[PDB]
Amino acid sequence: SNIAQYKVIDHAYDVVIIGAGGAGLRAAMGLGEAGFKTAVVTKMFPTRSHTTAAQGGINAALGSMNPDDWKWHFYDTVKGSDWLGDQNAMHYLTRNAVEAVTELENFGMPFSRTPEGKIYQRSFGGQSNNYGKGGVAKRTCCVADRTGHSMLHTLYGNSLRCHCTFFIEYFALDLLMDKGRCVGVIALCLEDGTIHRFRSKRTIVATGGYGRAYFSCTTAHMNTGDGTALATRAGIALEDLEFIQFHPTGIYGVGCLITEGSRGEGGFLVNSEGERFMERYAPKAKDLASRDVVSRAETIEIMEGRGVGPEKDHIYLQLHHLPAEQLHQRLPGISETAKIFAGVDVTKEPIPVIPTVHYNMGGIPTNYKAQVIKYTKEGGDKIVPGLYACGECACHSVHGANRLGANSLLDAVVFGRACSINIKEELKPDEKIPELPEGAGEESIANLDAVRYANGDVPTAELRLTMQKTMQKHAGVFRRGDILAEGVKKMMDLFKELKRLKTTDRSLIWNSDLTESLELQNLMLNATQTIVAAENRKESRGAHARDDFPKREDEYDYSKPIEGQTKRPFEKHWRKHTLTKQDPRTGHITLDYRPVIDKTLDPAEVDWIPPIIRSY
Amino acid sequence: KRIKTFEIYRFNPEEPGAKPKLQKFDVDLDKCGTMVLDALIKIKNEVDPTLTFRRSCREGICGSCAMNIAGENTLACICNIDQNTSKTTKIYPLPHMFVIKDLVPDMNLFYAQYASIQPWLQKKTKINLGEKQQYQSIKEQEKLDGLYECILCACCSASCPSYWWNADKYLGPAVLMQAYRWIIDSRDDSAAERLARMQDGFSAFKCHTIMNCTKTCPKHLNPARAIGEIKMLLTKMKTKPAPLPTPANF
Amino acid sequence: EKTPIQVWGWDYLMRQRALKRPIAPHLTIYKPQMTWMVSGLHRVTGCAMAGTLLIGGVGFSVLPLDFTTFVEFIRGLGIPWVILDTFKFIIAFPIAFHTLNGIRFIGFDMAKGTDIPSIYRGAYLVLGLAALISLAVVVYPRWERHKKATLPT
Amino acid sequence: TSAAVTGAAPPQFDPIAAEKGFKPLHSHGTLFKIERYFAAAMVPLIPAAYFIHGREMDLCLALALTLHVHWGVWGVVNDYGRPFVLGDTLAAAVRVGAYIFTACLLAGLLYFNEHDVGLTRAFEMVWEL
Ligand SMILES: Cc1cc2nc3c(=O)[nH]c(=O)nc-3n(C[C@H](O)[C@H](O)[C@H](O)COP(=O)(O)OP(=O)(O)OC[C@H]3O[C@@H](n4cnc5c(N)ncnc54)[C@H](O)[C@@H]3O)c2cc1C
Ligand code: HEM
Ligand SMILES: O=C(NCc1ccc(Cl)cc1Cl)c1ccccc1C(F)(F)F
Ligand code: SF4
Ligand code: F3S
Ligand code: FES
């Protein structure tokens, strides 16, 4: 606070939600239906949230197209995770999918329709009938090509009914902590420069991903991992940050997404030999193989000279063989995004695409109830009182080492809803709103003032560029110990260059320079923890692929028959979640590891799924 | 080197009794992306961090970057840069909106007006939420095509001269289309009460059929057609059809 | 009386007034188009006519001068036929265009022809016929007055 | 420092809470209908007035124009006569001026038809110049 005067404003709520995407708004609806005085803090108008950019669909075994079973969905969810996923949470996800997506419909979400009058479903990457033995599944419910747009707008519309009180364009600075409990949030009001402290019994972190750590991504400029940064500063270790989803088809030059649903409607990848190369890298599922396997397939084809376009550095996604009536009905949005950005009539020419950073299966560790946790190796999982997290910023972990397509919107709605269900049942009306500790959020304002008036010689836009550029080069699709370790070196030096930060805009009223710097600080905390976790991990599971450790290191060798082998001890194998404790001041990162939960929520309802070899 | 120049409206509300202004900025087209947002971002990062504007998605789906460019209301992230360097491109905020700073308008009447239509599905028989899907035929749901696409960006409202003078009473094309999006939804029962809210002379009838809304909409939608349709309904010249009956085997 | 949102909207405006905030440029900056220029013309022509009817009817009453001795005054200014017939065009057009465009706007009011191609054809179509009709109505009679100046019989 | 003061929630339009007491039926729909029918009805009347002349077309024109113009200026006044730019009472004054405008118009046309050449004739005399 040293230099300037800041107008602080106190607010009291039953629950504050940092976020207004799927997760954020679904949780507000639940809590406001359940009577609670809810506050939604979001740094941008909720409709601008990234959920709105989602395209392909949302998974649920509705069986509109053919018979289906949520257990078959559960299988694919677990196999998708390469057995890094907590199966209790993946149970909850899929068990509830039909209900959640049906609700979405009942809320007015205009799902595309089958002739029978039911919800249209398409095929998507990494899903199958019958516990991986039957054909290709069709669980992916959609509003054509804009499922995320339509879902978020429907959710938002319905959130104008729960008497939920929105704080729009408020930049969340930190969690308000009092002796290991979360009593609120502190944020900045862009409109007028005022600082806002929210007292609250509960606090739900629903902030989305950190795609802007990299140089090229499908994500928004607002995907800066603020929530995870918030958690790091609260003294909470983050989980599985090294697991970065590269989506196979992002438009070559510009990074805009072309949905996996374009493959699942019949489209396919083609290399410069005019060959449908996915028939080699995955004979069974071809173009619909899991996300990490396809992105690796493309990446090799580039590296072995089979790449397409002038520089032979991307590949083609061919759709023109499909009928123009299907393309306009199933894929109107990308049909247009391709025209604007690539200059491509998708009905005749193919789209130049290339793997692009997309999703973050890592995030804030929680139990299956979406309650944030710390982990000691003796005391195990210990919940953080008052704190929940959900959506992409969370790590339940329902995605483990590779997220299944159309499982995210689902994740956000399910666990967003789950928060309200859980708070309803654990929060009771005798308990009163916590009084803040003294000088609460004072360091948050200190940082604000410092960055606002930052006088250094490295300006905020250069630093972010070299962070993004670094992360792209070292912590890429294919990683190696020496490159990683050299990258960790560079990044830890960029963290130091943060003290030499220059800003220019000294205003408080809507200062996009100030916030973009705050965002950079946050981005550094995510990026640094991402790469040190990626360096230490000596194996190749899901989206994490080490060239110098190509095998997935489990407790057993699941390629050979299991019995007649001895269990490797926790410390030797790698089926375990990565935890990254970071001091936000020094930047130093300690590492720890947390067992993967293998039980389901109820063996009577469904049996767990023992690791096998992951082959699509 | 190819140097395009932009004339950008500026306003700083913190300066003592400040006035709006026009600021010229030169941009090398060969060190900048193809779209106008790219130019704004470059200028912000390489010249002037005080330059303030909304953005989020890079692909024209968020609606954050709505502003006035080359005279028309459009999205900066998908409007290409006019590469005729002898021309300057003028960039103003959404017309006739109160300006917080630079290209950032106050958007809360727009949003308030969006709330007032109750943009959520209503049914006269209370339904069990998780339990089953409502029936709607392909035909019936296709009536939403051209209506749900709306990203709620405000371009059309801020192009409407009726909404310029009477924003306080005329709901404007953006909200009016969305209102109609809940009226012709066959799963919605409250068609009657929705129309009831905009019965008066200003709410909808102050649409003077100017047609800027449909011309300028960057998502190629047509709100004039939807406002016209609401008028037909308000004058009893048309009714909403009855929901196609839900089959027995559903 | 007001709907609740209209009451909220007033309070919103008064708030914005209070915050000493500027209004983003509108007429001064918006690209002239066939959409809003034609509306502007439909109004201008509509209003101009009423104003002429008011300044006419109320004018020639309140003044000693009447319309016959007015026509004599301007006749006696001996001004060329090309200029007179222009003033007649200027008088016919407001009526022609407004009446034509009037029916176009009723179409819009019924959701008819609201797509941009139709909007633009309609705009041109109506400006056309109005000029054709205005010219027809000025020229044809003046052509008859030449068929009388120099004529057999 | 954080030695703050307690704050209120932002301005936010509760669409349900604004639904309790809002019955009133003031349907401007039927009026908007006849306004356009009347316009359509005037469509034939204009070329009719080109061909047929005299003191009764002068009278039909006088009436229908007066009525159609009354409805017109009313809207133009309601567009521009805004209380935000004029204050509440000057706005009311202008609204009243729309009625004064209609009433002088008719009186002015009645006078002109009754103590002068009349509308159609007056057009003839400029089209003879
Ligand atoms: C291009 C694209 C397409 C996709 N398509 C699909 C699909 O078809 N199907 C699918 O299942 N998944 C899809 N995904 C993944 C999925 O859409 C997202 O992961 C999901 O929507 C995230 O929801 P969320 O609520 O967790 O975060 P978001 O939807 O990103 O919302 C984040 C919220 O957090 C708020 N916030 C952030 N920082 C702060 C701060 N400091 N203070 C206050 N508020 C803050 C923001 O304002 C925002 O409201 C897609 C992702 C992308 C990038
Ligand atoms: C003969 C056929 C005519 C038709 C079909 C017609 C139609 C219309 C219509 C539809 C409007 C409403 C426009 C809106 O609200 O945006 C209107 C307005 C108006 N008309 Fe006419 N009209 C006709 C003749 C006339 C005449 C002869 C006058 C003579 C003074 C006139 C003066 C006006 C005025 C002043 C308005 C004011 C509203 C506005 O500018 O938008 N009209 N007319
Ligand atoms: O004001 C209108 N158009 C913009 C405009 C304003 C002033 C002038 Cl001088 C010219 C124009 Cl086009 C307008 C025109 C026809 C119908 C309705 C309007 C109004 F009132 F709604 F905006
Ligand atoms: S209609 Fe087109 S313009 Fe009007 S809001 Fe929806 S999108 Fe933006
Ligand atoms: S710009 Fe305005 S008046 Fe009506 S049709 Fe279009 S809304
Ligand atoms: S920034 Fe998303 S609409 Fe342009």
Q: Which of D11, D113, D28, D17 is nearest to D65 (CA)?
A: D113
CA angle B4, B7, B9 (to 5 degrees): 150
- The answer on whether B207 is annotated among ligand-binding residues is yes
Token pair 């789950």 in the structure block, residue? A418
Total H helices, total E strands in chain C:
6, 0
SS3 C20: coil
CA distances from A87 to A92, A578, A611 (A): 8, 17, 12
Residue B26, helix vs strand vs coil: strand
> B208 in ligand 3 pocket by Cβ < 6 Å?
yes
- Cβ atoms of D40 and D84 within 8 Å: the answer is no
End-to-end CA distance of chain B: 66
- What is the C-alpha R_g of chain D? 24
Q: Residue A266 is encoded by which pair of tokens?
A: 């019949």
Q: In whole angstroms, give the CA distance from residue B63 to residue A51.
A: 13
The dihedrals phi and psi of A479, each to the nearest 5 degrees, come to -120, 155
Q: For CA atoms A202, A208, A209, A215, give the dihedral sign.
A: negative
DSSP string, D53-106: -STTHHHHHHHHHHHHHHHHHHHHHHHH--HHHHHHHHHHHHHHHHHHHHHHHH
C18 touches chain B (CB under 8 A): no
- Residue A10 with chain D: CB contacts under 8 Å: 4-7
Q: Is C32 helix (H, G, I), strand (E, B) or coil?
A: coil
Buried/exposed code over B179-216 (b: 16+ C-beta within 10 A; e: otherwise): bbbbbbbbbbebbeebbbbbbbbbbbbbbbbbbbbbbb
Q: How many helices (H) and strands (E) does chain B have?
A: 8, 7
- A570-574 contacts: CB < 8 A, separation 24 or more? A570/A595, A574/A537, A574/A538, A574/A539, A574/A541
The answer on A47 and A166 residing in a single domain is yes
E strand or H helix at C122: helix C116-144
For A251, the enclosing helix (H) or strand (E) is: strand A244-251
Chains touching chain C through at least 3 C-beta pairs below 8 angstroms are: B, D
> CB-based burial of residue A462 (10 Å sphere; 0-12 exposed, 13-18 middle, 19+ buried)?
middle
Q: Of A391, A415, A434, which one is at a domain's C-terminal end?
A: A434
Q: How far apart are CA C99 and CA D44, in angstroms?
A: 10
- Which of A500, A488, A496 has the alpha carbon at shortest distance from A586? A496
**Contact (CB, 8 A) for A415 and A364:** no
Indicate the angle between helix axes D29-51 and B223-234, nearest 10 degrees: 100
Ligand 4 atom 2: the closest Cα is on which residue?
B217
Q: Dump the DSSP string for A393-459.
A: TEE-SSSTTSPPTT-HHHHHHHHHHHHHHHHHHH--TTS-PPPPPTTTTHHHHHHHHHHHT-B-SEE
Q: Cα–chain-centroid distance for residue B180?
A: 15
> Does residue B162 contact residue B132 with C-beta atoms inside 8 Å?
no
**In degrees, to the nearest 5, what angle opens at C-alpha C135 toward C-alphas C134 and C140?**
115
Return the domain boundaries, chain D.
1-129
Residue with tokens 């002739």: A115
Give the residue from chain B lying closest to D36, CA to CA: B235
SS (HEC) of B228-247: HHHHHHHCCCCCCCCCCCCC
Are A406 and A124 contacting, i.e. CB atoms less than 8 angstroms apart?
yes
Q: Does the CA dihedral A543-A549-A550-A553 come out positive or negative? A: negative
Amino acid found at A207: T
Phi, psi (5° rounding) for residue B217?
Answer: -55, 115
Cβ proximity of C25 and B73 under 8 Å: no
Distance CA B215, CA A340 (A): 18
The tokens of C101 are what?
């465009």
What CA–CA distance (Å, rounded) separates C139 from A559? 97
Alpha carbons within 13 A on the beta-carbon side of A8: 20
Alpha helices in A259-407 (DSSP H): 261-264, 278-281, 291-303, 324-330, 332-341
- Say yes or no: A578 and A597 in one domain: yes
SS3 at position A250: strand
Torsion of the alpha carbons at A148, A150, A153 and A154, rounded to the nearest 10? -120
d(CA A30, CA A390): 14
Which of A551, A571, A594 corresponds to the end of one domain? A551
CATH of the domain at A525: 1.20.58.100
Contact present, A183 and A323 (Cβ < 8 Å): no
Residue B45: enclosing H or E segment and its boundaries? Answer: helix B36-46
Give the end-to-end CA distance of chain A in Å, rounded to a whole number. 56
CA of C2 to the centre of ligand 2 (A): 27
Q: How far is CA A103 from CA A67, A96, A98, in A?
A: 20, 11, 9
A263 given a catalytic annotation: no
Residue A166 forms contact with D (CB below 8 Å): yes
Give the span between the Cα atoms of A568 and A556, in whole angstroms.
7
Q: What is the β-pairing status of strands A165-168 and A38-42?
A: parallel
Q: Is D46 in the pocket of ligand 2 (CB under 6 A)?
A: yes
Rounded distance between C-alpha atoms, residue A303 and residue A477, angstroms: 12
C-alpha closest to that of A38 among A15, A18, A58: A15
- Bridge partners, A544 (sequence order): A541
Exposed/middle/buried for residue C10 (C-beta within 10 Å: 0-12, 13-18, 19+): middle
CB A3 within 8 A of CB A190: no
Q: Is residue A170 domain-shared with residue A239, that is, in the same domain? A: yes
Give the relative orientation of helices D57-80 and D83-114 as an angle to the nearest 10 degrees: 170
Q: Distance from A41 to chain B by nearest Cα, in Å?
A: 16
> In angstroms, how far apart are the furthest CA atoms of chain C?
81
Does the domain formed by D1-129 have CATH 3.40.50.300? no
Q: How far apart are the C-alpha atoms of A528 and A525, rounded to whole Å?
A: 6
Which three-class secondary structure state does DSSP give residue C53? helix
Tokens of residue A346, six digits: 């998708």
Q: Residues followed by a break in chain B, C–N over 2.5 Å?
A: none
- Report the candidate in D126, D127, D98, D114 with the shortest Cα–Cα distance to residue D62: D114
Distance CA A368, CA A365 (A): 10
User: Hey, what's the torsion of the CAs at A242, A248, A251, A254, to 10 degrees?
Assistant: 10
Q: Which of A295, A315, A401 is CA-nearest to residue A356? A: A295
Q: Are A546 and A475 in contact (CB under 8 A)?
A: no
- Residue A49 near residue A26 (C-beta atoms within 8 A): no
Q: What is the DSSP string of B100-148?
A: EETTEE--HHHHHHHHTT--S---SS---TTT-PPP--HHHHHTTTTTT
Give, for C135, the enclosing helix (H) or strand (E): helix C116-144
Strand D5-6 and strand A8-18: pairing? parallel
Across-strand partners of B98?
C23
CB A597 within 8 Å of CB A608: no
| Closest to A101 measured CA to CA, from A417, A420, A423, A421 | A417
Buried b (16+ CB within 10 A) or exposed e, D61-81: bbebbbebbbbbbbbebbbeb
Cβ count near C113 (within 10 Å): 16
- Closest CA relative to residue A34, chosen from A164, A139, A201: A164
Domain C1-153 class, CATH top level: mainly alpha
Tell me the two tokens of residue D64.
Answer: 């229908």
Cis omega before residue D27 (within 30°)?
A: no
Query: CA A370, A373, A375 angle in degrees (round to 5)?
Result: 145
Q: How far apart are CA C137 and CA D67, in angstroms?
A: 26
CA-wise closest residue to A233 among A169, A185, A171, A194: A185
Which CB contacts under 8 angstroms, 24+ apart, belong to D123-126? D124/D53, D125/C67, D125/C68, D125/C71, D126/C71, D126/C87, D126/C88, D126/C91
In chain D, the N- to C-terminal Cα span, in Å, equals 85
**Nearest CB partner across the interface for B52, out of A157, A168, A510:** A510
Strand partners, A316: A270, A352
Asked if A439's CB is within 8 angstroms of D1's CB, the reply is: yes
In this structure, the dihedral spanned by the alpha carbons of residues A156, A157, A159 and A162, taken in order and rounded to 10 degrees, is: 180
Q: Which of A139, A146, A202, A291 is catalytic?
A: A291
Q: Which residues contact B135 (CB under 8 A, 6 or more apart)?
A: A117, B243, B244, B246, B247, B250
User: Distance from first CA to last CA of chain C, Å, rounded?
Assistant: 72
Reading the block at residue A522, the tokens are 């946050």
Helix (H) or strand (E) segment spanning residue A385: strand A380-389
What is the number of structural domains in chain A? 4
Q: Which of B141, B170, B146, B147 is nearest to B158 (CA)?
A: B170
Range of the domain at A484: 435-551
CA distance linking residue C126 with residue C120, whole number of Å: 10
Are B93 and B13 spatial neighbours (Cβ–Cβ below 8 Å)? no
CA-CA distance, C121 to C138, in Å (whole number)? 26
Q: Which of A43, A44, A45, A49 is nearest to A23 (CA)?
A: A49
> Nearest Cα to B168, choosing from C21, D83, D17?
D83
Rounded CA-CA distance A59/A191 in Å is 38
CA distances in angstroms from B37 to A516, B57, B74, listed in the order given: 16, 11, 11
Q: Do D28 and B205 touch (CB under 8 A)?
A: yes
- C-alpha–C-alpha distance, residues A7 and A15, integer Å: 23
Q: Which of A419, A434, A449 is the last residue of a domain?
A: A434
The SS3 of residue C45 is helix
Residues A122 and A266 in one domain: no
CB-CB contact of A548 with A540 (8 Å): no
* Shared-domain flag, residues A543 and A564: no
DSSP alpha helix (H) spans, A159-223: none
User: From the CB of B208, is ligand 5 less than 6 Å away?
Assistant: yes
Q: Is A75 on the interface with D (CB under 8 A)?
A: no
Is the Cβ–Cβ distance between A363 and A372 less than 8 Å? no
Cβ distance B13 to C21 less than 8 Å, yes or no, reads yes
- Looking up tokens 């190696």 gives A480
> How many Cα atoms are found within 13 Å in the side-chain-facing hemisphere of C68?
4
Nearest to B175 by CA among B196, B136, B140, B203: B203
For chain B, list the domains and their CATH numbers.
1-106 (3.10.20.30), 107-250 (1.10.1060.10)
A359 residue type, one letter? Y
| Interface touch D72/C50, C-beta < 8 Å | yes
Label residue D21 left, alpha or beta by phi (over 0 means left) and psi (-120 to 50 means alpha).
left
Cα A240 from Cα A393, distance rounded (Å)? 11
Beta strands in A472-538 (DSSP E): 501-502
Structure tokens at A575: 């089926």
In whole angstroms, how far apart are CA A139 and each of A58, A64, A67, A69, A127?
Answer: 8, 8, 10, 10, 8
Separation between Cα atoms, residue A519 and residue A224, nearest integer Å: 6
Check C57 against D115: CB less than 8 A apart.
no
Give resolution, Å, one decimal.
3.1
Phi, psi of B169 (to 5 degrees): -125, -35
* Residue showing tokens 């120099």: C150
Cβ neighbours of residue C132 closer than 8 Å, sequence gap 6 or more? none
Q: How many residues does chain B have?
A: 250
Portion 22-51 of C in contact with B at CB < 8 A:
22-26, 29-33, 35-36, 39
Strand A244-251 and strand A351-360: the pairing is antiparallel
- The most distant pair of C-alpha atoms in chain D lies apart, rounded to whole Å, by 86
Task: Please report where in the chains the tokens 């309140």 appear, as a residue.
Answer: C62
Helical residues (DSSP H) of A46-170, grouped into ranges: 70-80, 87-95, 97-106, 147-158
